[PDB]
Symmetry: C4
Subunit: 465 residues, 4 copies
């Protein structure tokens, strides 16, 4: 009873909402008629799996059995076509009930009319055994009518695109890979049908003496050898190679060769387009860094900077972004509030634990300080703090080595200047590339204004010193 | 009388302005000479439709009648060329009056000189019956002069581009589809003319014994069979296949084969370029999400985050953007003032109606509150509100489930903390992925400052509690 | 005397600065040695023009005279090679003086060493008559040494790239067109040299009985027919066609055919890449609008908006951006101060002249008001001003039609509300798509604070009403 | 002893941190077992260099020795295969110790299981001499088993990608060039193996009378001639040319020809994709300027500006950005504090030294003024300062010429207006394109508030004047 209703999985929770959001859709399926199928249920998924396997089997086997074999009266050929057309006739009946994702679940007002207006005629032609009707009522004209079963490609293309739009939502998949697999699966099928058609056309003309089958003397070999030579001819026309020694003499050979060349040329052009779209999406973060550095060196060339400054800015961007493009401010802006706190507790927590003033504080005070740190990268030779300055910023050390006028990683300098609000006494020069965390004086005074209990403690520090 | 003036349709209102803006253009057409055509009128549209149908008919039929048939004295061939060249001679006369969109409507100062300086000579050559003049004054040399009618391609290319620049403004069309249809329509016509030229060249030489027509023994067949073999040869040269058993022996066969190969190669290269430009524009919102997540995981790799935090940020972006790239702030910034209010009345109106304090308010007060809500997404396990905090924000619940230390969809929590301005007492943990609407305390105090009548009501609440 | 110094043209003013900036470079050329050429002067331009014409002539004519003709002792062939190698030997001497744009003008320290370290050996080999030396000292081995003159392609590629980097600065040119013309000019030259090589290889072997020349029986025809057949063979190998009836039998035919196929395949791949890069840059402003609307409809699909709101936002973006992407704020930010004032005096000046209060003002007061107008687009059905509101904004009408609860273009409404600072009395509904200019109350109060003389005038208005 | 530990070079400092960060990794290698190799050490680099040279040698030589020579019992062929398979067996043993960069250094828990689960079976098959075992236990069936040595391509692809991900971090390399060199190196190897396979297949069938070897009569020639003809056949199938006079008759010739055509077609499509991705990254800063100017002229076309204003804005953008796209504000934002000061000391220091008031100041005062200058570009004809204005900004002159109502480069005007805070007396018109540095009055008053010692000096100026 509940197999026709949408179950609660990851896809239904992502496409509807909570569990209560899925219960409303289940009640909506209940508010429809007697037995109405929902297109996200498990019954429709199992049925579409069975039908997709049958469509692949029929669209591979049916041209080969028609074109390369003797008669349509052999006993495995009749049982295979009658039992398959029964299942494709049940797929016509069950499409009156499923409803169309635009969802539509009301019956029979919108489903039946929206199905009759769009896809009923093609499914009706590809469902019924048309050739057996003309055979019972009334021989080589029935082999043309048996190719109406190849209109089951239209409901194959519909049923593949219904699953992929689901499975882009359930999983994380690249769209280029899915689309190029769809293109490869179409190209193989068109080459197979063209290989069957190359031998189908001279067979209806009782093998004229100018066709390739009578020239190469392969009228009475096995069907495998005939299929191999016909597929070689169709693939050499498809990939635009050049076949044979003489130009085609008969009139249906010329036009069908030209049709094969046009279809192969446009399929190969679409394959090149998909391969280019796949290759351009591989190295995006490497490419955007290159474009950004092109703009940087263009800014250098506009103001006519010297060569040493150009080299120095290049070394700075190499040690800053590392050939890798990102923008930390927008990434920290997009995240939520518990996710920003978790990243800072990995990077900035351990350096503040070295400082004796912040170690004894409450954790409600420390986390407000940790959000206002800023990441800075320096060079060997750069003077970090200069003498005679106001000293507004306090620095923590993550990596690198620097000297006061040696301080290794995990240290700190300029701490007492933010408390005394006076002139800096010493000067600091970086010995190598340093990674620092900076705290300004106003960003600390705001947090002192947020907590008056910690404000009393730093007043007792200032009275002692 | 008013057929020469621009009528008032969607295109004229979009390209000029209001109805009064179109009346000024109609008065400008009236201020011109005796009978002056405006290029956006209905007369020019109907005339260009008739002329485009004639150009397609002549550029298809005229090479086939010249190259594959016997004489130019048959009675349907004379009537078809005299009645068509009369219409192409009227198109030369009416171009003195229409005026050129750069508009120009003044006559005959700018129109006549700007037409004589650009396109008069080509239209004059492609208009007049040049071969009949040389035939009356004075035979196989007239078949070369009859191909001057193929310069009607130049005014075909002009008349197609005049409609498409209109119909990009009237309707919403993709530019890649229009441009690739123009390329396909050009490629078919060049292949048709090359198919006629392959048989035209040996005919003027009275079929030498080394040409392909005398080798394949098809001098005296029908014109359909000759056209099919000539088009097969031209298409195999065009798609770069390889033709025949021997290399071409005669000198006009070699150079014209080389010209066909060069023209086909450059047309196929432009087709691959257009197919790539069409494929790259299909999945843009899917691709920009992938580039953004490449930058996100690069930001992860720079600071060397642990694996569980990487997985958690990935799950957050999956449940936030859903594989789909957009930026809500700029989209809400671009819209107008009545359009922003209509979107909020669909999403944020129903949740505020649950709250008993905002239900009895005036609608002028509620809509100022509704603009300042912010959309937030949380995770299972994240603590939404923590104990011991100031509690500046009030939260409404759209989806998801959470627990106080169960609250389903449509609920709210933290409401009394914004009124009391005190410390939060309880803690809230989200059981699953929640979608919340947040209102800060300052964004509500601004709206309380906007309306002093509602400020009195919340004072009566604070005195009772 | 002044022909060796850089003259004052548009390029020199763009690459140096003012006239005084060019005088310093002229004095720098004067501070060099006795006769030193500057690479931006007129002498170097005229000399490079003469040399580029000679290089095109020699690189076209020299393979054909060697491979297809009888002897190198004919009197026009000796005079043409002696007088040309004199000019290519003067180009070796004058490269010791010109100096290299990295500029370098100091002689002979940097110029001579930087020339000897890079390009002296190739120019020395391509300059001197090597084969005549071996002919005087000591026959078919001299035809191989005469192809050392084809190393003049290396200084051709240098002299073309020196002009294009100049002429991208003098004029505005698309880079894709220049680069694809360079590629086409290289491809034609490689096909020409391969056409000469196809006949050069069997000639040194005294025409073996297995080569294509002895099979097709063309040993004793004219040089034009031999060149046409050899170029057809090289082009069919170049465009990957397929030649002849039998596979090549001799060993130098196989490897040189394979070299031709590899060179043609990589040149055709680079041509497809350049054609794609050219096609992608044609419709950029059309494509960015499509990407922006993809993000808009994705924002619609995320919050699950109804269909009528989707249609309404689509109509708004059609009447706002018109299928055309731009961002007015950044464009107005990039411009200078006199350019922003000129655009506003075209668009916003005529509407403010209708208002009687702003007509009698000083022009210093009006232009400060005109910078703070904002462009707004409304829809039919939207209520512009509602009753019971504060009325902070005053609106001017450019296009469209609206009704008070009819006001055509050029009108205004809501003017008295900004002066009285009271509640709006009437309501305005737009009948069609309107284009309005908005002025807020604070943006007008700032300009009233800027000018106290106009502040007295609006006080006399408020006392009368 | 220290050869197995990661040394301190530029790559290790970039991938770990400081010297103390590398010492922790060396202690981590010490904390592992008896002899454990670190994958960034020098031993693994030298070993991978030796193994990559051996893999290139074996994958080139091994098909040619099997397919084109007589027997596998010749004495150089046995010594070359036994001594090479010893080295490929040592590479199997040393992969139990190196540890996998995901790093992993713990043994044998994670290394051995993570190696057995992924790549042990392929390396085991490609390591051992399988054919000699079947030869000792028990002839043409051993030539098929000897091609198991061609599974050494799998550890070649692994060892190339391990170096390139290192050498993208050590040096600055474009990713497109590296990836297209990998593709070319793969394509040459596949064409070589296909050339060996074309002759391998008829040899196992004892040269049937229908194969190409017996048709072209080359059974008993040398191995070089057979290799040249086989490679020509495989390359003509690979580049999709068309081979021979007749279609292939035998069944293994048809299917292997079809496999060659499919492999060549997909490799050529990937080559076109890589060439397009390489060409699109050459002219990025030229292309972004073109896209920006497309948006500019679209903003012009939306508001229907006159032609002279369009020309004037075009001339402004030509003299502003010079066909070259950059954004100075974000570039100055990304840099550090000592790098911003170094650029200003090149450009803005020399112009301020002309002014007599700023020459006698302290250098701590001047550098705070220099950060607040703004770069401006004017046109000929634009009025820079107008009479009757407040005069908030002071201007310095870098280039260009202008007149007061002549001032060359290096001058200044409007200096006294910022000190007097009064109305400007004169008007300035630019004679040509000027480049100016602007200082506002509030940006100077902030620096006067920063330094009270300089504030006393400008008070003594104001009392004298
Ligand atoms: C991957 C392509 C999927 C093939 C689609 C169907 C199953 C998809 C899945 C099947 C297995 C999955 C395993 C998944 O790994 C996880 O599930 C995460 C970790 C975990 O929870 O175990 C990653 C990709 C996924 C490969 C993709 C495919 C686009 C549809 C083709 C089916 C039909 C239309 C011919
Ligand atoms: C679509 C391409 C249009 C073909 C152009 C001419 C009619 C255009 C129209 C004709 C029918 C339209 C129906 C339209 O649908 C609506 O009109 C919106 C709903 C409604 O109001 O009904 C969408 C696309 C439109 C397909 C496009 C085309 C670019 C020009 C080619 C004509 C000539 C140069 C050979
Ligand atoms: C256009 C390509 C130019 C061909 C280059 C040399 C002259 C350039 C000029 C020659 C004529 C120009 C006319 C110019 O129009 C104007 O000058 C603006 C209006 C005016 O002032 O008249 C636009 C493009 C310009 C076409 C381009 C080209 C890139 C270099 C090739 C020369 C050599 C390396 C083979
Ligand atoms: C360049 C490609 C490098 C070839 C890689 C290996 C050495 C790399 C180096 C070797 C020489 C370098 C010289 C370097 O120039 C400098 O070192 C800066 C100035 C200086 O310090 O001297 C620029 C590029 C570098 C060319 C690149 C390449 C991607 C790996 C291929 C090796 C193996 C996988 C087949």
């Amino acid at each position: 009873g509940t197999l026709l209703q949408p179950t609660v999985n990851k896809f239904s929770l992502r496409v509807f909402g909570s569990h209560k959001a899925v219960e409303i859709e289940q009640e909506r399926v209940k508010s429809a008629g007697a037995w109405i199928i929902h297109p996200y249920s498990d019954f429709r998924f199992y049925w579409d799996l069975i039908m997709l396997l049958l469509m692949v089997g029929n669209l591979i086997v049916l041209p080969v059995g028609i074109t390369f074999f003797k008669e349509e009266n052999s006993p495995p050929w009749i049982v295979f076509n009658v039992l398959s057309d029964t299942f494709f006739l049940l797929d016509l009946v069950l499409n009156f009930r499923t409803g169309i994702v635009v969802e539509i679940l009301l019956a029979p007002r919108a489903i039946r009319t929206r199905y009759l207006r769009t896809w009923f005629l093609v499914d009706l032609i590809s469902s019924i055994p048309v050739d057996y009707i003309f055979l019972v009522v009334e021989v080589r004209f029935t082999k043309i009518l048996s190719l109406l079963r190849l209109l089951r490609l239209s409901r194959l293309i519909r049923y593949i695109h219904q699953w992929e739009e689901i499975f882009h939502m359930t999983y994380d998949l690249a769209s280029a890979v899915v689309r190029i697999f769809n293109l490869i699966g179409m190209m193989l099928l068109l080459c197979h049908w063209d290989g069957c058609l190359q031998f189908l056309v001279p067979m209806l003309q009782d093998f004229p003496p100018d066709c390739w089958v009578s020239i190469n003397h392969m009228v009475n070999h096995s069907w495998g050898r005939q299929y191999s030579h016909a597929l070689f001819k169709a693939m050499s026309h498809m990939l635009c190679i050049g076949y044979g020694q003489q130009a085609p003499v008969g009139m249906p050979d010329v036009w069908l060769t030209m049709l094969s060349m046009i279809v192969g040329a446009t399929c190969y052009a679409m394959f090149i387009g998909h391969a280019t779209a796949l290759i351009q999406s591989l190295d995006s973060s490497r490419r955007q860094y290159q474009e950004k550095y092109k703009q940087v060196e263009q800014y250098m060339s506009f103001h006519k900077l010297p060569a040493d400054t150009r080299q120095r800015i290049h070394e700075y961007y190499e040690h800053r972004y590392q050939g890798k493009m990102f923008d930390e401010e927008s990434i920290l802006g997009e995240l939520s509030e518990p996710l920003r706190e978790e990243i800072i507790n990995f990077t900035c927590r351990g350096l503040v634990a070295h400082m004796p003033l912040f170690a004894h504080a409450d954790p409600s005070f420390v986390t407000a300080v940790l959000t206002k740190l800023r990441f800075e990268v320096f060079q060997p030779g750069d003077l970090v703090v200069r003498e005679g300055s106001v000293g507004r910023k306090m620095y923590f050390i993550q990596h690198g080595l620097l000297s006061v006028l040696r301080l290794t990683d995990g240290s700190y300098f300029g701490e007492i200047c933010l408390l005394t609000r006076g002139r800096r006494t010493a000067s600091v020069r970086a010995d190598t590339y340093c990674r620092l965390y900076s705290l300004s004086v106003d960003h600390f005074n705001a947090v002192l204004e947020e907590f008056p209990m910690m404000r009393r403690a730093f007043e007792t520090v200032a009275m002692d010193r």
